[PDB]
Structures are given as C-alpha cells and as structure tokens.
Amino acid sequence: SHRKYEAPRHGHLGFLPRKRAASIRARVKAFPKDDRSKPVALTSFLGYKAGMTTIVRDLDRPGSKFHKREVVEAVTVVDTPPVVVVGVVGYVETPRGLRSLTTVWAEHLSDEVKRRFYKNWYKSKKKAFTKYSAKYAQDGAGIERELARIKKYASVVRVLVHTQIRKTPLAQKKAHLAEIQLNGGSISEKVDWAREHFEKTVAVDSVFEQNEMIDAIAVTKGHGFEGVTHRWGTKKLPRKTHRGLRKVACIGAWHPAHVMWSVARAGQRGYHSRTSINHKIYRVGKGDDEANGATSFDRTKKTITPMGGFVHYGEIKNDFIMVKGCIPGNRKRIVTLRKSLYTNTSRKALEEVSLKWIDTASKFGKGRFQTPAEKHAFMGTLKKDL
Amino acid sequence: MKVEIDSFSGAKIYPGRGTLFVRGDSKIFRFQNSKSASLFKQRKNPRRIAWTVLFRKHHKKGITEEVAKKRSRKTVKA
Amino acid sequence: SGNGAQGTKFRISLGLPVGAIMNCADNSGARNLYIIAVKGSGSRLNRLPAASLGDMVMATVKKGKPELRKKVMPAIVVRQAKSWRRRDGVFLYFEDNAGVIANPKGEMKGSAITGPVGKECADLWPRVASNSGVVV
RNA sequence: GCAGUCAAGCGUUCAUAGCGACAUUGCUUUUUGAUUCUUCGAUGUCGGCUCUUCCUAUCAUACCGAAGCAGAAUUCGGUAAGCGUUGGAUUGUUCACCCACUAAUAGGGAACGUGAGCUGGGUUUAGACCGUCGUGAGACAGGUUAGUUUUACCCUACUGAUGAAUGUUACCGCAAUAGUAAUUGAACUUAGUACGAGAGGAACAGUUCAUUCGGAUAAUUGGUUUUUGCGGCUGUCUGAUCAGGCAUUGCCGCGAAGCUACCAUCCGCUGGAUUAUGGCUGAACGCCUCUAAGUCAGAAUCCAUGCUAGAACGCGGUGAUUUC
RNA sequence: CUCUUAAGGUAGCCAAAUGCCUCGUCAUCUAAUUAGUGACGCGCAUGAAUGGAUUAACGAGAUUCCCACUGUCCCUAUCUA
RNA sequence: GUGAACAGCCUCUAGUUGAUAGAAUAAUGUAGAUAAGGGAAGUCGGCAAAAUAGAUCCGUAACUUCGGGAUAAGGAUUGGC
Ligand SMILES: [Mg+2]
Ligand SMILES: [Mg+2]
Ligand SMILES: [Mg+2]
Ligand SMILES: [Mg+2]
Ligand SMILES: [Mg+2]
Ligand SMILES: [Mg+2]
Ligand SMILES: [Mg+2]
Ligand SMILES: [Mg+2]
Ligand SMILES: [Mg+2]
Ligand SMILES: [Mg+2]
Ligand SMILES: [Mg+2]
Ligand SMILES: [Mg+2]
Ligand SMILES: [Mg+2]
Ligand SMILES: [Mg+2]
Ligand SMILES: [Mg+2]
Ligand SMILES: [Mg+2]
Ligand SMILES: [Mg+2]
Ligand SMILES: [Mg+2]
Ligand SMILES: [Mg+2]
Ligand SMILES: [Mg+2]
Ligand SMILES: [Mg+2]
Ligand SMILES: [Mg+2]
Ligand SMILES: [Mg+2]
Ligand SMILES: [Mg+2]
Ligand SMILES: [Mg+2]
Ligand SMILES: [Mg+2]
Ligand SMILES: [Mg+2]
C-alpha cells in the first residue's frame, strides 16, 4: 500500500558514503577558471583555525529596516602565517585526464617540511634530498632542462607550498604541504615567477583582500560511531517500544528482498570533508603589528587574541584571516582557503565592511572585561597587588 | 555601540552579552549573565550579596574613588 | 502577516504553538485567547504550527464576555515571554503571553492596549502602534 | 474505476468554448465477485506509528495552446513524477464528516509494503453481563468488560571499520565508476498602472524577508552536572573546635570544559543540449504550409560546472633505498 | 367496528451493558465530537423476586468533562551505574 | 539517636567483607535523573512520570438511610538563639 502521509526525505544523498576521510587535510578538487591576462598569483592558501568572536558593524543595505544601524555578527579567525614555496610541478592533458610529468624541488629544504617524509624522525640519518642537492653545484645543467621541459609542455602549472608550523602555538613540529595552482598567463612566466620564489615565503596579503568572498575547505569534526537518530534526524519512536526506541522502525519492505541504499543506518558520523562557499572576509591582519583588534572607531591598543588566549589554541602572534560565519572543522585543524570560482554580485558580496568594535573578552568563562588595564581600573587594588 | 550596567550586579554589559527582561509594569532590567538572572528570579536583595557593587557602596569597601570638589572661597577678580 | 502587513518581519523564535492560552491585552472585554492556528504557516508531518511576536493567528476566546465566546476570530500577539534575538544581539523576553483581538484586515476590536508591546509588532501593524501605550 | 468512436440535444444564434442522451469499442486489478492451481508435520491473519522506493489516470510549482479568456477570477488540454501535498474533534477504523492554515492539502503499488521494528483499540480460545432463539445442553460479523505478543551469535543485504599480495617505504597527484539538491510564498516598487463606461483590476525587471529540506559551527543565549568546583542545609558518627565518614550521586543555589537547539549562528554555484509550443527558408501540390532536407528560440527536463567516495587486481611524478 | 388468544406489557424505564435502520431527532459541552450528558419513543427484540426505578457510603470495575502538573508530543539534548 | 512509631537513615555488642576480574567509556540497551516556551495538541485511553503530602490555626457545598460525605474544596505558619 501507499505511504499514508507524505513527508520529505531524511538526509541528503549527495554526501554519501559517510565514511572517514582519507587524510586529515581536505584536498581541493576544483580551482577557479584561469584567465590568461592577470599577473601570476596563487589561487588558495593554508591556515589553521583558531576560534570565533563577535563583531559590531553598521549594515549598508538600502531597503532593509536596519539600513545604517549597528548589528552584531559572529566571525571566525584562521591563523595564517606566510607559506614557503618549495618547487613546482606541471600537468599535461591526456584523453584520460590531466597527468603530471615532472616535479622540481628547491635546493634547501627546512626541517619542518622534510619531517613530512618520515614516520620516525628521531631515529634517522636525515638523508632526504641529499643526492638531489648534488643536482645543483653545476650552473643549470640538471635543472634548466627540466624547466625547459615544463615550458614546452604542461599546459597547467601547480606550485608546492608548505606551512611554517613552528610559528604557531601548536605542538605539531611537522609542517603541512600542498599544491596551489597559479593563475597568471603564458606558463613560461608562471614557472619563471616560481623560480626566484623558490625557498622564499608568500604572505596571505599577496593572495587575499578585504571584502573578498572566499571558500573554506577542511575536514569536519568527528564524533565516532553514532546512532541513526542523531546521524540522520529521523523521528524518535514512541516511549512504550520494546527492544529499544532510538532506531528506525521499517528499514525496507518485503520486496525487493534487500535493504535499499537510501535507508538511514547507524554508522560513522563526522570527520568527512566539506566545502563551504560564499564567505566574506572581514579583516586581513598583519601579525607584526599590535592593535590588531583596534578599529577606526575604538582606537585602543589591543591584539586580536582574547583574555587568557584562545581556548585550546593559544595566541595569534602571526598573520590571520578573519571571516564571517562558520567554517567546517574544529579548532587546531588545517584549513584551505580558496578564491571564488565565479563573479558573484549578489548586491551583498561587494558590500564594503568597516568594523566598529571587536570583542576580546575571555572565552574561558563569562568574561566581563576587555583588557587587564580595564579590569584593574574597574576593580581597584586587590590583595595580590602591592 | 553602547555599554550598559547590570541591573543586579552593576557590571558592564558589552553588546550581544547577557539578557534583558521586561516586567509586567513595563520596567526594563538588564543582566550580564545567568548567575544574576537566576538571583533576580529567586528575588534576592543585592544589598545582602557580598560581591555586588551596590553592597560595597552600602558597606564602604574599596571606596578609594572620588574624594571631593574644590570651590574657591575668595574674590571673583572679575 | 498578510493583508495588513505593512512590511516584512525577520524570523524570530516561535514560542506559541497551537493550544497556547495568552492574556487578552485590549479593552474588548475578552480576558484570554486560545490559539488554534497561525496565518501563513507551513506544513510538515507532526510539526505543530507555532506563533511568534507580531504574527497573526486565528483564535477563540475560552473564557470572557459571552458575546465573544464560541466563535473563531483573528488576533495579533504583542507579548511572547520566550527570549528571541534582535539584530543587536540583545536577548529579551516578557514575563507573560499577550494578544489583542482584531478583524481579518488588522482593525483592532478594542480601543486601548494594556502593558507593553513589542517593537516588531508595532512596526508591522500600524494600528496597534497607534493604540500602543509603551513600545520596547 | 478510467479513456475512446457516432451525434439527438444543452449552450440568447452555434454540436464539438465547455457538456453530451439512445448506442458502441477498449484498458486496470487499488473494490467486490467466480474457480480452487501452491501452502492445513502452520508463510503470524486488521489497523495505527516510523521509513525507503516506484507508477501516472497531475492538486500545486515550470513552460505553452484553447474559451461563451476586456482586466481579475475560472475551465479544458499538452510536455512534465524533480520537488511538496498538513495540524486537529468523533470512530480500532479503510472510508466518512467538520474546524483551520496553505500554492496544494492528487490517486495508487511494493505478500491488502512494513509484529525476531513497536502497540494490541478490533478481530481471534477459556471468565462474565444483556437482548432474541431453544423445554434443555447451547447459538448469534448482535452489544459490553478483563484477557502471557518468544529467539539472532549463522549466511546474505546494508551502514560503517581492518587487511596479505604487485622490490620496500613515504609524500604529492589524475579520474573510470557510483551518488547528487535545493523548494515555495509574502510585502514594497512597478501600479491603483495596463484593460474596462463603471464596479473592479494585472504582469516582466528591482529590493527586503519568509516556509520545507540539507551541510556545518558554538563568538553570544538556553539545557545538561561526577569538574563531585564552591557555598548552604537535615539526621547520625569521629570527646568538643577544626576537618571529615555514612544517607546506593543525601538535598538546595550557583556552577567552568565538553555535547547540544530553527530554542543559537553561517552557508546551499552557472553553462550547454532538449520536450510541449511559436517561427525562418521551402518543395511536395508552378499557389500555400514549422517539414520532407536544413535551421532559430525555448521547462522545475537531460548532460555538464560544482559537491561525496576513489577501482582495496585503474594510472602518474618525486625522496631514500641497509655490510660485518 | 371486527378476527384471534389463556391473557393480549399495567406501574415504570430506554438508541441503556438490551435498537438492525443508527453517526435515530432536538439541546448542551468544543472552532470542529460515530464519544459524554439531558429530553422524545409503534421499543427488530425494555419491563416487574427471570425482579422494575432511584439510592447516602463503598470499588486496584467501565466511561465523559474541568483545575494543577508534567519530554506523551512540538523536538529533541545531556549526566550516572 | 532522629523521629508518633519493632516506619526510613546513622551507630554500639555480635557477624560478614561473599557474588570471575583487569583496561577503556562507541551505537543500541537495563536501572536512575534533568530539561528553555507551550501544557495532553501524542495516543483507543493522561499508559509512564510530575504535581499535593507531616504537624498547628482558619474554613468546609450538593446530597443523605442523619450515622456520613470530610483530611471535602481552599488558605496561613514551621530553622537557630
Ligand atoms: Mg502518495
Ligand atoms: Mg544539526
Ligand atoms: Mg511492551
Ligand atoms: Mg566558553
Ligand atoms: Mg549556561
Ligand atoms: Mg502524527
Ligand atoms: Mg486458494
Ligand atoms: Mg493450512
Ligand atoms: Mg512447514
Ligand atoms: Mg516469515
Ligand atoms: Mg501524462
Ligand atoms: Mg491525532
Ligand atoms: Mg491488490
Ligand atoms: Mg508498510
Ligand atoms: Mg518482518
Ligand atoms: Mg470469551
Ligand atoms: Mg426461554
Ligand atoms: Mg463470531
Ligand atoms: Mg538484532
Ligand atoms: Mg558522473
Ligand atoms: Mg554549558
Ligand atoms: Mg513562409
Ligand atoms: Mg429480561
Ligand atoms: Mg522523642
Ligand atoms: Mg527503628
Ligand atoms: Mg554471578
Ligand atoms: Mg504560624
């Protein structure tokens, strides 16, 4: 017989299978379509999620009831120290897809990056690239031919970058490595641009800009084996149900004599890779600068880090990217930031944003003060003080 | 952005923090957190809660603030 | 919302499902309202229709002046008692639930309104704004 | 139950705008029947709850043709099953009937889908009461009340989770295949405009929001307390104080961290090819015609972009490759 | 007035645990009630120790409504062994 | 001892320290709990849970077989010195 009362599907079928991701660093599967006119520049960046805070700003939206009035918004901050460029690779089209044909590496590799190639670093003779470095010390013989190859072929060029993990408060000691597609024109200059940038660093400012809409790509937070109710949000069974009530009643009809793939079942939850789009940048911060949390309206010297530092992370002594809303993945997880794939007008993506005030109260409790000087002023002298 | 004063504890309330409660007599109360909100619901008296500003004002504790106002006692010279 | 809605209302947390009884805030002689429906509400299996501040509901008076009972009539809520969020980030809530009896196109049956009324409701129904004592 | 063919009439005139008698051709097995082919060394037999998928004989949404389409509203039909189709009073109810919102509250299948998923209201043992029938034991899809609902560790299917073998190990990659998602409404303006004598009364573009669903997140608000963190309180015990035990977490208030809520916040892309239909050129048929060759525009359609896995017997680049 | 019986249901009561038609008809309770209650009765087939109708108190009996209460529900979340 | 009490809780004399254990704290379970706003809208049906609860003072309807209903309903107080 037919279903008595109609109801929408539970869950989305475009995200199956709900299995653990292959790696902790989500891989970007698409890049913005290249334009052979703009100068050579990156299309993405690497950073680490720090935390969230609150912002007050004047909305600029003609027509809404809150035109030219203050609103509060929730934002998240990603600590983004400048990445280091080490080598580039090229890809050539095939009737079976893009294929890599040659990889080149820089002469000197730092320890934090060459630790990526070892599962037991402390017991090792540190023999990494020790014969590749010998490919130098001759003018350009063993390398300039490789570059000539890449110039002659390899319609698409990607560059290898790695994070400066030691600059963060993490206890990782092992940097992250990733590919970023260049987006200039005339690949010969793309590879030229990479050449002098070998072993050099790239600041996030060189890639991103204020009020620019971007995309966040990272592996979401995991929760272990999860029941079907919380995994899919299906209706809970009535109370007086024998043999459990946190289940699904009918997992399939008699025929076909199998349980369909579309029936919600218990299993893993979280730790999937997710791609979130249309996030606006609210502030690009320069790390070697106090008064990051200061605005043109506030004008009190205070950094972006809250009282007592970000919970479970620490301070933001490096550069950072500040973005409206929520991004996938929890704190201390690697996150990839990608430029937009299409020109988005929306009458919203191009709204200029000027902050009024940035919250820096303690997130380890119901913080009441913004600065230790303010706290001392309010509370007066204590027993601890002299 | 305007900062207000907690109606019970006297603490400062930054934007987006705490709650606001409108009583039937159209009187407005603000609270910085749930601790104060609950104490107000329990109908406690602030003057008997040892850590609130109104209590300290009533007991002259930590009151090394403002001292006096000096007004000259002489000819105007104008 | 609907015929008398002079503007649009941002979503605010629903605190009045069907069956809720709220005080009557006007001088129409009714003393309480019993919600049985919410105008402009969607449909989802086992989802109880719910009302929030500023909505228009179809309701009956359960106890009050006899010439009002035993018939359905539109009403507009003015007090919620469930905390909701403005743009400002302030969370506010009254201490009771309150509504006013009105005709289908927004004409108030009473003449005056006792107690405070929410700003979103005043801004959405001009007539209750005019007949409003205190607006918060 | 649904759809055709003929045409006496209805429709101010007029058969086919919309209907359509007397006749007549068909389809379905979701109703009820006919037979008794399989099961009586047992296939658990109504309904309700929850959940997935499929059909079109399409209620709304998309795009169009026609009217006894001035506008508004409405009716008939075409491509269309992607998306949605409710909250309640009474009844075990299928069905039925009323209240109300909504764009709409369409019809059906999956062993009359679904009891080792639930319930047991009815049916469906034994107790009992009433009415009718019988002299009597007793009978009544006539009424009422109380009546034990078993087992998964096996194989397969599904959700997740390891893993030998391709000289070893590590890093960065490609993408065959499989899945796919967003949906609808309101207000302002257009505009009291077009149309209409009037009463009445639109639409395209633009702005702000909202309904259902989905994926995340916890800066703020709320919840949860074994943080047994702090304070308080009752009985009893340690001679008293201090500081503690016991009362199966003793109770009360607050209560960080974590988890979590349309009860909180953020986000949900743009190109091509088409269906119905309207056309261009133009014969067949010296005229004419969207059609025969050719071609243009076109829908919530299809395929791409994008999103999720990544063949454990699909593939590429790179580092290091052991001596007593 | 008439046929027939031994007599032809009186006092009472009722869609009741007894009425198929039946969700009887009217009123009330609700926005809406095949439920409940109060009336009517040519009652398939109510009715007098086969006992009829009420009845204070009593009932781990059955049923309807109201107040307080609450995760039964909107809509799920968390903690302990 | 507390307390109206051979009620519940703690202790003295007396008697036991027995019930396969160790490590973690996923889903679903069994037992125990808490939840903002609404308050039975779920369901055949308030099934399960929650609300009241001791003592002192005030007040106590219809009906009746005059004995009851009655702790009716509904209010106020409760520590220590
Ligand atoms: Mg259906
Ligand atoms: Mg969720
Ligand atoms: Mg059971
Ligand atoms: Mg915190
Ligand atoms: Mg809290
Ligand atoms: Mg339901
Ligand atoms: Mg047979
Ligand atoms: Mg048989
Ligand atoms: Mg057999
Ligand atoms: Mg079987
Ligand atoms: Mg069709
Ligand atoms: Mg129901
Ligand atoms: Mg059938
Ligand atoms: Mg079924
Ligand atoms: Mg079965
Ligand atoms: Mg029996
Ligand atoms: Mg007899
Ligand atoms: Mg029978
Ligand atoms: Mg099992
Ligand atoms: Mg594909
Ligand atoms: Mg908390
Ligand atoms: Mg022509
Ligand atoms: Mg008898
Ligand atoms: Mg005593
Ligand atoms: Mg005793
Ligand atoms: Mg044992
Ligand atoms: Mg007293």
Side-chain angles (χ1 to χ4, degrees), chain C residues 7-11 13 37-49 82 85 91:
Chain C
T8 50
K9 184 163 61 93
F10 194 92
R11 172 181 168 85
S13 308
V38 179
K39 304 282 281 173
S41 66
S43 297
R44 172 58 156 82
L45 198 60
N46 309 281
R47 178 81 58 69
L48 290 176
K82 192 215 179 313
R85 200 182 103 95
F91 280 106

Side-chain angles (χ1 to χ4, degrees), chain B residues 48-62 68:
Chain B
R48 305 181 108 189
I49 301 299
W51 51 266
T52 186
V53 65
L54 183 62
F55 168 85
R56 307 188 97 175
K57 189 69 159 289
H58 177 265
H59 272 54
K60 294 152 301 313
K61 273 163 179 308

Side-chain angles (χ1 to χ4, degrees), chain A residues 176-192:
Chain A
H176 289 100
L177 181 49
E179 295 180 355
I180 297 169
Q181 184 177 2
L182 293 175
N183 220 357
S186 59
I187 62 170
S188 56
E189 66 183 1
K190 290 194 205 277
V191 298
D192 292 358

Side-chain angles (χ1 to χ4, degrees), chain A residues 293-321:
Chain A
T295 74
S296 69
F297 180 87
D298 193 309
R299 277 174 284 171
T300 70
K301 302 190 69 167
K302 62 174 188 185
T303 49
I304 185 57
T305 183
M307 310 265 288
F310 275 111
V311 176
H312 289 112
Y313 186 84
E315 284 97 321
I316 311 296
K317 306 201 306 318
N318 304 327
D319 299 332
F320 63 94
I321 301 299

Side-chain angles (χ1 to χ4, degrees), chain A residues 134-204:
Chain A
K135 193 183 299 321
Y136 288 84
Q138 296 294 321
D139 298 332
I143 285 179
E144 293 293 345
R145 72 191 70 263
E146 294 306 288
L147 304 195
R149 289 258 297 292
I150 291 142
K151 285 164 149 171
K152 195 185 193 180
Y153 309 108
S155 81
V156 177
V157 181
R158 305 195 174 152
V159 65
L160 291 202
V161 310
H162 80 88
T163 62
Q164 299 207 81
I165 188 74
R166 54 167 180 82
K167 281 189 148 62
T168 65
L170 282 173
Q172 183 55 340
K173 281 194 189 167
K174 180 198 288 192
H176 289 100
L177 181 49
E179 295 180 355
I180 297 169
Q181 184 177 2
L182 293 175
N183 220 357
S186 59
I187 62 170
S188 56
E189 66 183 1
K190 290 194 205 277
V191 298
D192 292 358
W193 187 95
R195 179 66 182 87
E196 69 274 15
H197 284 86
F198 271 16
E199 290 183 33
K200 284 200 210 320
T201 193
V202 171
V204 72

Side-chain angles (χ1 to χ4, degrees), chain C residues 50-130:
Chain C
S52 68
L53 180 62
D55 313 333
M56 180 195 258
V57 301
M58 303 292 324
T60 62
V61 64
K62 264 282 171 273
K63 63 166 295 315
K65 186 180 289 293
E67 292 81 3
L68 294 174
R69 295 220 290 101
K70 306 201 70 192
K71 64 163 61 43
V72 306
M73 64 184 73
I76 297 169
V77 302
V78 295
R79 293 197 283 269
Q80 180 145 301
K82 192 215 179 313
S83 62
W84 82 96
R85 200 182 103 95
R86 284 201 200 130
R87 283 84 169 93
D88 301 355
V90 61
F91 280 106
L92 73 165
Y93 66 107
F94 298 86
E95 77 170 319
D96 71 345
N97 294 173
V100 181
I101 279 173
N103 82 331
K105 65 153 61 53
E107 303 305 82
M108 270 181 31
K109 212 194 180 62
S111 66
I113 305 191
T114 74
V117 302
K119 184 180 74 174
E120 292 87 318
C121 166
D123 291 331
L124 208 71
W125 306 96
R127 214 60 80 71
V128 310
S130 67

